[PDB]
Amino acid sequence: RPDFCLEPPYTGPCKARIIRYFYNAKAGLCQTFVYGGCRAKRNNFKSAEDCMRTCGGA
Amino acid sequence: RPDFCLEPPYTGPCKARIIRYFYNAKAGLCQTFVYGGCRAKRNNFKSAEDCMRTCGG
Amino acid sequence: RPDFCLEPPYTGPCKARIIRYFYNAKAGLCQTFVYGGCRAKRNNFKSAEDCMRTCGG
Amino acid sequence: RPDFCLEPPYTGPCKARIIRYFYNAKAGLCQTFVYGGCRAKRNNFKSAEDCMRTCGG
Amino acid sequence: RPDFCLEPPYTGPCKARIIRYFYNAKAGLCQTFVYGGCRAKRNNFKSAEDCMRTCGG
Amino acid sequence: RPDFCLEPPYTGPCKARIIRYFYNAKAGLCQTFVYGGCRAKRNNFKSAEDCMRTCGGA
Amino acid sequence: RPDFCLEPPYTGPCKARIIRYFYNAKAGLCQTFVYGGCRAKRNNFKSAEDCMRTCGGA
Amino acid sequence: RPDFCLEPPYTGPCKARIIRYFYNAKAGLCQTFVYGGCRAKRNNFKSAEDCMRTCG
Amino acid sequence: RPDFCLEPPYTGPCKARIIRYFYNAKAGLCQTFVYGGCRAKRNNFKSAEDCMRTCG
Amino acid sequence: RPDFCLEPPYTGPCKARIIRYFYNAKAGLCQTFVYGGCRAKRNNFKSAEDCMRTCGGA
Ligand SMILES: [Hg+2]
Ligand SMILES: [Hg+2]
Ligand SMILES: [Hg+2]
Ligand SMILES: [Hg+2]
Ligand SMILES: [Hg+2]
Ligand SMILES: [Hg+2]
Ligand SMILES: [Hg+2]
Ligand SMILES: [Hg+2]
Ligand SMILES: [Hg+2]
Ligand SMILES: [Hg+2]
């Protein structure tokens, strides 16, 4: 998996309350977090399918 | 039916207000609850189809 | 993990070609398959989040 | 539970292949079927939430 | 028509502000209301198609 | 309601098999039909909410 | 086009913050507005395709 | 109005049958067409909001 | 690239909190911003496909 | 960017006709392809936002 999959989730400075997915390398799966709407980092997926595929395997 | 289906719904600490589904054992069907956006337990489904099949029967 | 997470994915006899998710116990991850639209088995999820969470651990 | 919940699912004459939900009384939950796109009967829900609440209990 | 189609719409005690559909028996049509996310009554539809079809006739 | 709400549903010449809604003035509600993807007439709604509101009352 | 296409957008008294489309007759196209979730008037569409087709032309 | 807004809708060579939106310069509005799933030209919108705003 | 692609994202005066896409000319790609629900400028896409194709 | 962003799009052996996004490294952006529903490779995204963020830059 890409190293960015090891990043902690990043809400960002904006004020929306949007459900996004991040890879939790300890749990070995993707989990939800609240994304603020701007300045996303790469461990942030709109689709849980994309999170699993991008980050699931190494 | 998995045992996690018997747990009460868990909103969690986060501040989003997102519709999710949980199995209500007492009622014998899936129902809606408000999910906060993080730290979900297993009695938590984005899709009602998934909730029924996983926790029903 | 629910035992149904260990079932091979099941398309069924119907003629739709719908993306669904199943847990691959060998690979230890959810993957897509083509669902026919009827007679689903339990290792079949509309949502990928539901697949990962229900069939993880 | 409305009586229409006890009818078998009805695909109809049209040629689309669309996932819908119907209540399976024998099984005591909603299930998927393929809907053709026209001439629907009432045991036909776009949303699984709607199916459970309308036909469950 | 199911009798539950005659219930006034019910927001419930939860704090989400989600669009749902209800049948207005007086007007003879489905209309929107704001659903709070928990303790739904049956005159509550995620899909407008489901509302019209379930509560029509 | 607009007169176009009295039109019979129109699939059109294209080959997609898309669910759309039309107002059935006899039934007094909107029903599904299969839309082909092109050359829509006005009694054709992507959302069933829009069909009810646009065509429901006179 | 139906005369309801000439009305200003109507949020209504309810407290949701939902994106809907209204036809802007001066602009000749549909635009977004915030709908409150109840007491809709007819110049209010869930889908932009529906808005533009219904209030399309003359 | 971007010049690509005046181009005819392009289905392309692929075999999917998916509703997309295109701006019809003559009609003065966005309409539906069938998109094959690959090699999209720019007069091709998944969202009708985007079509009207971009091309209208 | 249409010139509107070079404009900064515009939230507007309305009170909704909705994810939209804008083309960031500097970064050379589309990114998310919060849109208030009214008075959208053209560098505003509901679909990221439309943003990349239109502005990329 | 992850090296999987360099692979050509992969339809796979299954028979569905689903729209997915792949990163076109030469073009510098994501484009649509038809996915068959199984045996996905990693340059395959349900959401265009995810594709562009994951395979974004270098
Ligand atoms: Hg996967
Ligand atoms: Hg089921
Ligand atoms: Hg999870
Ligand atoms: Hg329910
Ligand atoms: Hg109907
Ligand atoms: Hg209505
Ligand atoms: Hg149109
Ligand atoms: Hg617009
Ligand atoms: Hg593109
Ligand atoms: Hg991005």
Instruction: In whole angstroms, give the CA distance from residue I52 to residue G53.
Output: 26
For chain F, what is the radius of gyration of the CA atoms? 11
Cβ-Cβ contacts under 8 Å between A and C: the total is 29
Domain ranges, ordered by start, for chain B = 1-57
3-state helix, strand, coil in chain H (%, to 5): 20, 25, 50
Measured CA to CA in angstroms, residue F34 lies from D37, H37, I10, J30 at distances of 6, 20, 38, 31
**Residue F15 CA to ligand 5 centre (angstroms):** 24
Helix (H) or strand (E) holding E31: strand E29-35
- The residue in chain B having the minimum alpha-carbon distance to the alpha carbon of residue E35 is B19
Length of chain F: 58
- Calculate the dihedral angle through the C-alpha atoms of B26, B27, B30, B33, rounding to the nearest 10 degrees: -80
Instruction: In whole angstroms, give the CA distance from residue H17 to residue F19.
Output: 13
Do E44 and E20 form a contact (C-beta atoms < 8 A)? yes
- The residue in chain B having the minimum alpha-carbon distance to the alpha carbon of residue D31 is B49
Which one-letter amino acid corresponds to residue B3?
D
Instruction: In whole angstroms, give the CA distance from residue D16 to residue D38.
Output: 9
Helix (H) or strand (E) holding C50: helix C48-54
Q: Which two tokens stand for residue D13?
A: 């004459």
Closest to E16 in 3D by CA, of A8, A47, B16, F16: B16
Do B49 and C46 form a contact (C-beta atoms < 8 A)? yes
Largest CA distance in chain G: 35
3-state secondary structure of C53: helix
**Residue H49 CA to ligand 8 centre (angstroms):** 6
Q: Which ligand is nearest to the CA of H44?
A: 9
**Residue H2 CA to ligand 5 centre (angstroms):** 41
* Chains interfacing with D (3 or more CB pairs < 8 Å): B, C, E, F
Q: Which two tokens stand for residue A13?
A: 């400075």
Do G33 and G7 form a contact (C-beta atoms < 8 A)? no
3-state secondary structure of I16: coil
For chain E, what is the radius of gyration of the CA atoms? 11
Sequence-ordered alpha helix ranges (H) in chain I: 48-55
Cβ-Cβ contacts under 8 Å between C and D: the total is 22
Instruction: In whole angstroms, give the CA distance from residue G11 to residue G20.
Output: 9
What kind of experiment solved this structure? X-ray
* Chains interfacing with H (3 or more CB pairs < 8 Å): F, G, I, J
The DSSP letter of residue H13 is S
**Residue G53 CA to ligand 3 centre (angstroms):** 41
3-state helix, strand, coil in chain G (%, to 5): 20, 25, 55
Q: Which residues contact C34 (CB under 8 A, 6 or more apart)?
A: C11, C17, C18, C19, C20, J14, J15, J16, J36, J37, J38
* Chains interfacing with B (3 or more CB pairs < 8 Å): A, C, D, E
Q: Do chains J and F touch (3 or more CB pairs under 8 A)?
A: no
Instruction: In whole angstroms, give the CA distance from residue D30 to residue D43.
Output: 10
In the structure, ligand 2 is a single-atom ion and the residues with CB under 5 Å from it are: B 52-53; D 31
Instruction: In whole angstroms, give the CA distance from residue D4 to residue D1.
Output: 8
Instruction: In whole angstroms, give the CA distance from residue F46 to residue G49.
Output: 7
Measured over the CA atoms of residue H15, residue H21, residue H23 and residue H24, the dihedral's sign is positive
Q: In CATH terms, is domain J1-58 a member of 3.40.190.10?
A: no
Do B37 and B12 form a contact (C-beta atoms < 8 A)? yes
The class that CATH gives domain B1-57 is: few secondary structures
Closest to F51 in 3D by CA, of H29, F39, F27: F27
3-state secondary structure of I32: strand
Do H22 and H44 form a contact (C-beta atoms < 8 A)? yes
3-state secondary structure of I30: strand
Side-chain half-sphere CA neighbours of D56 within 13 A: 26
Which residues of chain I make contact with H45, given a CB cutoff of 8 A? 47, 50
Q: Give all strands (DSSP E) within chain H, no chain letters.
A: 18-24, 29-35
In the structure, ligand 4 is a single-atom ion and the residues with CB under 5 Å from it are: B 31; D 52-53
Sequence-ordered alpha helix ranges (H) in chain A: 48-55
Q: Which two tokens stand for residue B18?
A: 């997102």
Beta-bridge mates of residue E22: E31
Helix (H) or strand (E) holding F52: helix F48-55
CATH of domain H1-56: 4.10.410.10
Do G57 and H29 form a contact (C-beta atoms < 8 A)? yes
Q: Report the 10 Å Cβ neighbour count for C52.
A: 25
Which residues of chain B make contact with E17, given a CB cutoff of 8 A? 17
3-state secondary structure of A58: coil
The DSSP secondary structure of D3-51, one letter per residue, reads GGGGSPP---S----EEEEEEETTTTEEEEEEE-SSS--SS-BSSHHHH
Instruction: In whole angstroms, give the CA distance from residue E43 to residue E6.
Output: 8
Task: Name the phi and psi angles at H6, rounded to 5.
Answer: -95, -5
Instruction: In whole angstroms, give the CA distance from residue I55 to residue I1.
Output: 5
Chain E: which residues have CB within 8 Å of chain D?
2, 40, 42, 44-47, 49-50, 53-54
Q: Which residues contact D7 (CB under 8 A, 6 or more apart)?
A: D41, D42, D43
In the structure, ligand 7 is a single-atom ion and the residues with CB under 5 Å from it are: G 52-53; H 31
Report the first-to-last Cα separation within chain E, whole angstroms.
Answer: 6
Which residues of chain C make contact with J15, given a CB cutoff of 8 A? 17, 34
3-state secondary structure of F3: helix
Interchain CB distance below 8 Å, H30 and G21: no
The DSSP letter of residue B53 is H
Beta-bridge mates of residue J44: none
In the structure, ligand 5 is a single-atom ion and the residues with CB under 5 Å from it are: E 52-53; F 31
Which residues of chain I make contact with J21, given a CB cutoff of 8 A? 49
- Calculate the dihedral angle through the C-alpha atoms of G54, H2, H8, H11, rounding to the nearest 10 degrees: -90
Do J5 and A50 form a contact (C-beta atoms < 8 A)? no
Q: Which two tokens stand for residue I12?
A: 């507007």
Q: Which residues contact F26 (CB under 8 A, 6 or more apart)?
A: none
Interchain CB distance below 8 Å, H47 and G48: yes
Do B27 and B4 form a contact (C-beta atoms < 8 A)? no
Do G32 and G10 form a contact (C-beta atoms < 8 A)? no
Interchain CB distance below 8 Å, A18 and B15: no
Task: Name the phi and psi angles at A51, rounded to 5.
Answer: -65, -50
